[PDB]
Ligand binder design. Structure first.
Ligand SMILES: *C(=O)[C@@H]([C@@H]1NC(C(=O)O)=C(S[C@@H]2CN[C@H](C(=O)Nc3cccc(C(=O)O)c3)C2)[C@@H]1C)[C@@H](C)O
Length: 129
């Protein structure tokens, strides 16, 4: 269980992302989670911050630091993951995460994770599964 019924939610299996307001969604979007080599965990993560013109930095699973200046970012925790809008990725659908192999988190459409930033609040829960 997480909070009142509001949260970001994803389904990697089904490569689809959501926002949830009212236990129902605010967002419905198609995504791509992280690559098979370094899979996404799915379960319960947390947007304790929603972002605008964020930058997805860090280090690759290889030890190769990176950046991805994102329009909208939810730096979620304890899992490494992070849901975000992805203007750089033109695909979302059936399993891209394996073929396109994008890092470890969920690559959400630029149009939706904005909405998100607009509905989710610092403290909203994040899910992928
Ligand atoms: C979505 O993919 C999201 C982030 N991508 C990555 C990623 O690893 O590329 C993660 S996991 C996160 C990345 N930064 C940490 C990490 O792996 N550090 C690391 C890894 C290997 C070696 C070193 C080192 O030598 O210091 C460090 C964990 C995350 C889902 C957004 C932000 O792009």
């Amino acid at each position: 269980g997480h909070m009142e019924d509001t949260y970001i939610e994803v389904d990697l299996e089904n490569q689809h992302m959501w926002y949830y307001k009212d236990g129902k969604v605010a967002l419905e979007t198609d995504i791509v989670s992280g690559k098979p080599t370094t899979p996404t965990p799915a379960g319960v993560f947390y947007v304790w911050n929603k972002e605008e013109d964020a930058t997805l930095k860090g280090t690759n699973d290889d030890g190769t630091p990176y950046e991805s200046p994102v329009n909208y970012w939810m730096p979620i925790d304890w899992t490494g993951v992070g849901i975000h809008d992805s203007d750089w990725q033109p695909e979302y659908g059936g399993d891209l995460w394996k073929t396109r192999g994008s890092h470890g988190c969920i690559n959400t459409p630029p149009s939706v994770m904005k909405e998100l930033f607009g509905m989710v609040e610092k403290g909203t829960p994040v899910l992928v599964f």
